[PDB]
């Protein structure tokens, strides 16, 4: 042993250092300075040469690479000797393994007997030793001995990791002993002689047994017998001659004999020395088994325990020999049958007709798994039982030995099961002793799952027994007679001292079981390439678990729920998926919240706040629902801190009233600053958001709570103002106004832009209306918002005409619509003027009747024209009037046109801010000068007239029922103005219709390489149309942003019109320079050009791939929760990924998988390359040669790759303009409409993983590596070491990666800002302002992330809110998941976060309670004057 460590290097021509250090043997060919071909088919000539490798000059960094190379060589040798299986007898399979290990160890500058080109290896080893000896520390042999000790301690846990054939046992050597078991520290001559004699014996004994068998198998055999005898006599005399030669060599060595190669000295010393049947019940052992003690195996340590049935089985007593007997191929079956018939009475003790069938099933399954040799109970009579079974099978059946065992079990299990039911006379194969089930009784399940099921059933029996008494006495009838049973049940549930659990709380056992299940799932999903659906895997633990993960039983709770039936667990219908949280268990002062499955819980299911015989506590019902919650706990009348749930308010410890403003009041100011923002955000969220009786009961409780909190906060602020005046502080209204302005500026303006006054002219109206007017009215706006919030529920919980007006047909005639049916008008973009608005039935212009008749005639004409059919607003095929038919039987878009005309007339009569012809403006101004309940009455009369018109039309046509309710009788109730927004919507609908028509025309006339036919004209017309519509959209979007700066235009235009679902205004109206060169045809280059796309690799000529719309990444972005289908934020990195090249091909392909696959592959490769190049150029500006920047860039690239993988696999969370249509078209292409979404997702995952040379994953990774190389080429630097690795682990859920990125960014920003502030704190004011501005939203972000994490922290596919797997989390809460994950340095492969905030301070760092104590009063005193200056400037 020595202190010199090794195997801790990183990126030495290998995967990464993080993969190792777990005492595992995954090491691949890489990492050994190179990227065993010498393998044979199998004085002295031993076989060492055919079981050795030669994979072993200034390229190695230190001893780490050498040790890694030797470990890789040892692992390869072990894998070779295991897979080859020179002797499948399984009796001596690892003796050769340890002999080869000893030979390899001795090859390291020791006794070398290799006859051949052995000089190069020794020369290289000597050079390596000299290189490592360059540093002179201690007077060559010492370093060699230390390295040998390290190799001895390490490789023994790597080479033996493959074989598991067999004082611990069940694995040759020891993969888990942590100390070498046996060392072959003997001369190589004696070891080789021993191996030779062992091989000779093993061969000759088996051959003579085979010859004896063949002698009786026959019935010139005598001639063959004598020839074989002569050959074996020749072999014997040859062996005798070899023995004599070895004896002569030993004599010569002894004659020559008559710390300086200690091995040789010890060899000489050794040479001189030589020359000179009833088992009681059990307790469900939950501990690992010792050499001669019961318990689980090392791998299943502290895992599910052994039921008493397994420890009382008849077979697990001694070797396979019957108790009553004194002692073939068929004899084994008879022995097994007799053993089964003897075991049956032992299990017959429990007399039942339902509890015995399951016991027999489990016993049969355990017998099968023990016969196969895959058991884990491993009592004191298991190590020898397997050896005896192997010896018996070798002489009876001597592919592999495990497969033969499985085949024998599958063939004989019928008789084995029929013999365990009182069977003496075996028939050919109810009336027997037992009738559990049918003959097969298939129970091919791993022992772990069966043990879990048995333990769950045993626990549930006692649970039912207890809850029966708890319910029979507490069925709502309980002053004192019920408390006893409830207390007894609570004690039983949490008793850290019933049957099982090995005297430990059920929670710890459940946690261990869940951890083991997660480990099994990870092992079967990550390191297992042989999945299911294989030519339906026969039997394997990894294969079976893959079936469960594919089905959705990722977590043990789902499997337990699926298996258990009839709700026998308690009989109160307690589900296993639902989780229950109780305060704590006192057994083994401080309370720790414990969350477990519902059955475990703390009391009978749904008996919370009722097991005590109390009132329903409606407040508790509202709180427990986890909906509409507020995490605030607001005669002295001094201060009401209103501490947020969690960290407690602490004194600043630095405030002083001597020559200062005040102390102890800054905490209240910070609390109010956080409160007025959190409550505002909650109110907005609940306003945007809509059994409803209880929902509004909880909502009203929340409203009252927030009202009381606001009153208390107002009183506290009044007291603060009085205290400040006692010795200037802004009032509450001024503070609210400043908060509103700051919140609206930070999101849009970058860091409180200096010229706050300069803002969009239209945005001033919005800011003054929604914050308030010039005068301070902060309280009024909050009160109005509260009133609106209350009114939200107040409204939610609520749920003749015969005169002939067709006689005056004059003045208006058939208008010239947008068509040639016998001169077409176009948009004129104030904002815009729709074609219908410029010309209407206003040719006539007592007045009321004239207007009523005019609108009557206009509506009649519009309806008639729509019925006639048109291609301006209605979509139809070439024939027309077919396919698109409204269910009511009316044309399409008639209601919208009527509403728009009515709104236009209303605005005309009212004369609002509408851009129209000058003469029309003068006319309406004069009308207003000549002349608002009367307006409402006139509108009602107009609506009644329209309804009468509709009724008359229905009567004259008689097509369906229409009483003026074709689309709604109520007037347009749109709160937003319907003048500009209506015009924008009409323009959007027209654009949708025309774009769809152009798509159809192009795909019908340009489907079947330059362009010479009709494609040119159509595409040119489309290009001109797209240019015009791009100008129009630019103007309209500018107007909308100046008017509505918060909401977006694309979402509004696409949500209200199903026509534009494949229209992406971001791509169609791109303002970049490449949009006119690379995609000159406006989103249809792939169709109009009729060309083909390809990805060109690095080794190609100058024809590079520089056709992309990628834009240089930005650094001043912020996290946004938009475009998401709760409490999860999209990182800025995901908001900048290149998805522009995917849309054209996506919309191009339709049911064309044959070519769509290649198109998507090439485009994805190009996109990945461009994204990697741009990210690398972003994270390494000015060509700085630093390591941390490279690690950050590699982490960002890997995150982008994982995001792309999730997008392609359909596991994406955000639905942006691109992603929505991308996913829709991917679902449409893969599979079909008949297939369920699960099948399509599975097909997509299979296509992403496998090719159906290299997989798509590897191709994309190579594309990203090529992009990184291109990025580096511009700086003439060294290729990064974190991008030259091919293997990558399976991606975690996107939420976890987003949370890790958020934590890393927050820690980096915190460190930067705190260092800047402390080193400068007259610049402390700006530092404090920046710190507060950056920290204010992070608190809300962290709260949302923590809430979402707690929602699905350890859920599964069928348990989590979303359709995603989260069983790998295994984290009690968010904070502890960030511990040990953001502790070490950044590595670039796995570790991508570093934070010096491991403790429970992130929830406090979000506030200013502790970390900002020394700079709290200072920052407050800078903000005060800043607030005053900003307020006076705004005022």
- Token readout for 19 is 């993969």
- Which residue's entry shows tokens 């979509």? 875
Element containing residue 595 per DSSP (H, E): strand 594-597
Q: What is the DSSP string of 56-68?
A: ------SHHHHHH
CA 1281 to chain centre: 27
- On the 0-12 / 13-18 / 19+ scale of CB atoms within 10 A, 1149 is buried
Rounded-to-integer distance, Cα 1017 and Cα 778, Å: 61
Q: What is the domain range of residue 710?
A: 665-797
Q: What is the DSSP string of 185-246?
A: -S-HHHHHHHHHHHHHHHHHHHHHHHHHHHHHHH--HHHHHHHHHHHHHHHHHHHHHHHHHH
Element containing residue 699 per DSSP (H, E): helix 692-726
Q: How was this entry determined? A: cryo-EM
CB-CB neighbours of 485 under 10 Å = 21
Cβ(887)–Cβ(966) below 8 Å: no
The backbone torsions φ and ψ at residue 313, rounded to the nearest 5 degrees and listed phi first, read: -65, 145
Rounded-to-integer distance, Cα 317 and Cα 382, Å: 9
C-alpha torsion sign, points 580, 584, 585, 588: positive
Resolution (A): 3.4
Rounded-to-integer distance, Cα 450 and Cα 452, Å: 5
What letter does residue 45 receive in the DSSP assignment? -
Rounded-to-integer distance, Cα 949 and Cα 1066, Å: 43
C-alpha distances (whole Å) from 669 to each of 440, 665, 722, 1379 are 75, 7, 14, 32
What letter does residue 1358 receive in the DSSP assignment? T
Cβ(1062)–Cβ(1147) below 8 Å: yes
- Which residue's entry shows tokens 């609390």? 671
Which domain CATH number covers 746? 1.20.1310.20
Rounded-to-integer distance, Cα 836 and Cα 866, Å: 13
Rounded-to-integer distance, Cα 1272 and Cα 1280, Å: 9
Rounded-to-integer distance, Cα 389 and Cα 379, Å: 16
Cβ(1142)–Cβ(1163) below 8 Å: yes
CB-CB neighbours of 1034 under 10 Å = 13
Rounded-to-integer distance, Cα 1056 and Cα 1034, Å: 20
Rounded-to-integer distance, Cα 761 and Cα 264, Å: 95
C-alpha torsion sign, points 763, 764, 765, 771: positive
Rounded-to-integer distance, Cα 1183 and Cα 1171, Å: 18
Query: Residue 685: how many CA atoms within 13 Å on its side-chain side?
Result: 17
| Pick from 472, 362, 487: nearest CA to 417 | 362
- Which residue's entry shows tokens 């907005």? 684
**C-alpha torsion 989→995→1001→1006, nearest 10:** -170
């Amino acid at each position: 042993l020595k202190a010199d460590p090794s195997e801790v290097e990183y990126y030495r021509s290998g995967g990464d250092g993080d993969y190792l250090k777990n005492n595992i043997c995954k090491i691949t060919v890489n990492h050994s300075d190179s990227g065993c071909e010498k393998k044979l088919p199998p004085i002295c000539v031993p076989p060492r040469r055919e079981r050795l490798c030669t994979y072993n000059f200034d390229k190695i960094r230190d001893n780490n690479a050498f040790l890694a190379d030797v470990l890789l060589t040892a692992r390869n040798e072990g894998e070779k000797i295991v897979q080859n299986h020179p002797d499948t007898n399984s009796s001596n399979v690892c003796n050769a393994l340890e002999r080869s290990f000893a030979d390899l160890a001795d090859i390291i500058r020791g006794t070398d007997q290799w006859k051949g080109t052995n000089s190069n290896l020794e020369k290289n080893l000597k050079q390596m030793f000299a290189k490592i000896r360059e540093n002179d520390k201690v007077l060559y042999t010492k370093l060699r001995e230390a390295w040998w000790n390290a190799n001895r301690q390490k490789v023994w846990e790597v080479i033996t990791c493959g074989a598991r054939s067999n004082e611990l046992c069940r694995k040759c050597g020891h993969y888990e002993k942590e100390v070498p078991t046996k060392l072959d520290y003997v001369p190589q001559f004696l070891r080789w002689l021993t191996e030779w004699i062992e091989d000779f014996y093993r061969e000759k004994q088996n051959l003579i047994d085979d010859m004896e068998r063949h002698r009786e198998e026959c019935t010139s055999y005598c001639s063959t017998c004598k020839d074989k005898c002569k050959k074996y006599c020749e072999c014997v005399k040859k062996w005798k001659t070899e023995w004599e030669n070895q004896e002569n060599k030993y004599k010569d060595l002894y004659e020559q004999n008559k710390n300086t190669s200690r091995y040789d000295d010890y060899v000489k010393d050794f040479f001189e020395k030589l020359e000179a049947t009833s088992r009681s019940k059990k307790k469900w052992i939950w501990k690992k088994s010792s050499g001669n003690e019961e318990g689980l195996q090392e791998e299943y340590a502290n895992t599910i325990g052994l039921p008493p049935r397994t420890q009382s089985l008849y077979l697990g007593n001694l070797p396979k020999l019957e108790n009553v007997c004194e002692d073939g191929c068929l004899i084994v079956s008879f022995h097994e049958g007799k053993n089964l018939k003897k075991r049956y009475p032992q299990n017959k003790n429990s007399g039942n007709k339902e509890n015995l069938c399951k016991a027999l099933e489990y016993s049969f399954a355990d017998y099968g798994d023990l016969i196969k040799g895959t058991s884990i109970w491993d009592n004191e009579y298991t190590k020898d039982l397997e050896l005896n079974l192997q010896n018996n099978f070798g002489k009876l059946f001597g592919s592999s030995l495990d497969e033969l065992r499985e085949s024998w079990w599958n063939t004989n299990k019928k008789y084995i099961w029929t013999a365990m039911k009182h069977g003496a006379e075996m028939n050919i194969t109810t009336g027997s002793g037992s009738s559990c089930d049918d003959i097969p009784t298939i129970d091919l399940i791993p022992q772990y799952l069966r043990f879990l099921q048995e333990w769950v059933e045993n626990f549930c029996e006692q649970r039912q027994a207890k809850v029966k008494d708890v319910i029979t006495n507490c069925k709502s009838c309980c002053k004192t007679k019920c408390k006893d049973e409830c207390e007894k049940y609570k004690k039983f549930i949490e008793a850290c001292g019933g049957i099982g659990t090995a005297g430990s709380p059920w929670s710890k056992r459940w946690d261990q079981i869940y951890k083991r299940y997660s480990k099994h799932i990870e092992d079967a999903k990550r390191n297992r390439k042989a999945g299911t659906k294989n030519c339906c895997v026969q039997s394997d633990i990894d294969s079976f678990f893959k079936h469960l993960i594919d089905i959705g039983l990722t977590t043990p709770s789902s499997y337990l729920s699926n298996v258990l039936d009839d709700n026998i667990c308690g009989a109160d219908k307690a589900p296993w998926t639902t989780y229950t949280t109780y305060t704590t268990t006192e057994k083994c002062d401080t309370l720790v919240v414990v969350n477990v499955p519902s059955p475990l819980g703390n009391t009978p299911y749904r008996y919370k706040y009722a097991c005590q015989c109390k009132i329903p506590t409606n407040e508790e019902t509202c709180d427990d629902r986890k909906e509409y919650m507020n995490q605030w706990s607001c005669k002295n009348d001094n201060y009401e801190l209103c501490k947020y749930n969690g960290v407690d308010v602490k004194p600043t410890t630095v405030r002083s009233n001597s020559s200062k403003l005040d102390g102890n009041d800054v905490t209240f100011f910070n609390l109010f600053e956080q409160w007025n923002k959190e409550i505002q955000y909650q109110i907005e969220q609940y306003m945007t958001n809509a059994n409803c009786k209880e929902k509004c009961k909880c909502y009203k409780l929340w409203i009252e709570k927030i009202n009381d909190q606001w009153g208390k906060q107002k009183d506290n602020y009044n007291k603060f103002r009085s205290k400040q005046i006692y010795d200037k502080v802004v009032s509450l209204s001024n503070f609210l106004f400043f908060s509103c302005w700051e919140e609206y500026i930070q999101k849009y303006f970058n860091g409180d832009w200096s010229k706050i006054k300069n803002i969009g002219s239209d945005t001033f109206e919005f800011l003054i209306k929604k914050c308030g007017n010039n005068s301070a009215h902060g309280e009024e706006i909050f009160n109005e918002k509260l009133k609106n919030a209350e009114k939200k529920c107040k409204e939610n919980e609520s749920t003749s005409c015969d005169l002939n007006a067709t006689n005056y047909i004059r003045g208006c005639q058939s208008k010239t619509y947008d068509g040639k049916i016998f001169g077409e008008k176009q948009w004129i973009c104030g904002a815009c003027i729709p074609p219908r608005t410029q010309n209407l039935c206003v040719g006539e212009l007592l007045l009321k009747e004239k207007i009523k008749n005019a609108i009557h005639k206009e509506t009649e004409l519009l309806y008639e024209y729509h019925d006639t059919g048109t291609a301006i607003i209605s979509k139809n095929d070439k024939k027309g009037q077919k396919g698109k038919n409204d269910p009511n039987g009316l044309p399409k878009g008639f209601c919208h046109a009527v509403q728009r005309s009515f709104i236009d007339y209303k605005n005309m009569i009212l004369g609002t801010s509408v851009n129209i012809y000058e003469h029309i403006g003068k006319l309406q101004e004069d009308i207003k000068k000549i002349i608002n309940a009367w307006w409402k009455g006139i509108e009602r009369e107009m609506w009644d007239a329209v309804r009468c018109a509709i009724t008359k039309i229905n009567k004259k046509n008689n097509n369906s029922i229409f009483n003026g309710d074709e689309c709604g009788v109520s007037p347009p109730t749109g709160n937003d103005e319907d003048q500009s927004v209506s015009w924008f919507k009409e323009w959007g609908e027209q654009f949708c219709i025309e774009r769809l028509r152009y798509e159809q025309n192009i795909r019908e006339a340009c489907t079947i390489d330059k362009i010479q036919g009709a494609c040119k004209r159509k595409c040119e017309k489309y290009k001109k149309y797209i240019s015009e519509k791009k100008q129009e959209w630019d103007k309209q979007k500018t107007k909308y942003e100046n008017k509505y700066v918060g909401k977006s235009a694309s979402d509004l235009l696409k949500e209200n019109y199903p026509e534009c679902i494949s229209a992406n205004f971001d791509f169609i109206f791109n303002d970049n320079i490449e949009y006119k060169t690379y995609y000159p045809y406006g989103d249809y280059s792939s169709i109009c050009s009729c060309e083909q796309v390809k990805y060109y690799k690095y080794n190609n000529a100058e024809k590079k791939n520089n056709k992309s719309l990628c834009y240089e990444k930005d650094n001043d972005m912020t996290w946004s929760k938009k475009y998401i289908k709760e409490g999860v934020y999209v990182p800025p990195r995901r908001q900048q990924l290149c998805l522009y090249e995917l849309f054209p091909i996506i919309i191009k392909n339709e049911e064309g998988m044959e070519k769509a696959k290649e198109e998507l592959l090439e485009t994805l490769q190009i996109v990945a390359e461009r994204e990697a190049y741009y990210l690398w150029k972003q994270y390494n500006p000015t060509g700085k040669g630093i390591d941390d920047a490279n690690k950050k860039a590699c982490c960002a690239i890997r995150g982008s790759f994982y995001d792309l993988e999730d997008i392609i696999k359909g596991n994406d969370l955000v639905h942006d303009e691109y992603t929505k249509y991308i996913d829709s078209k991917l679902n449409e292409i893969f599979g079909s409409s008949d297939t369920n979404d699960i099948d399509t997702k599975r097909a997509r995952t299979d296509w992403w993983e496998n090719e159906t040379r290299k997989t798509i994953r590897q191709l994309v990774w190579d594309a990203m590596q090529s992009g990184v190389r291109y990025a580096v080429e511009e700086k003439n630097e060294n290729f990064p070491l974190c991008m030259g690795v091919e293997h990558i682990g399976i991606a975690k859920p996107q939420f976890i990666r987003w949370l890790e990125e958020w934590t890393n960014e927050f820690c980096e920003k915190y460190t930067k800002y705190f260092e800047d502030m402390k080193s400068k704190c007259i610049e402390c004011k700006k530092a404090c302002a920046n710190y507060t501005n950056w920290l204010n939203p992070k608190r809300i972000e962290w709260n949302g992330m923590s809430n979402y994490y707690n929602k699905i922290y350890r859920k599964s596919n069928k348990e989590s809110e979303g359709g995603k797997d989260y069983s790998m989390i295994m984290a009690p809460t968010v904070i502890d998941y960030l511990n040990k994950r953001c502790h070490g340095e950044i590595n670039g492969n796995y570790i991508c976060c570093s934070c010096k905030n491991i403790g429970a301070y992130n929830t406090t760092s979000g506030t200013v309670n502790k970390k900002l104590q020394k700079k709290e009063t200072e920052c407050e005193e800078e903000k005060g004057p800043l607030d005053l200056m900003n307020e006076v400037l705004n005022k």
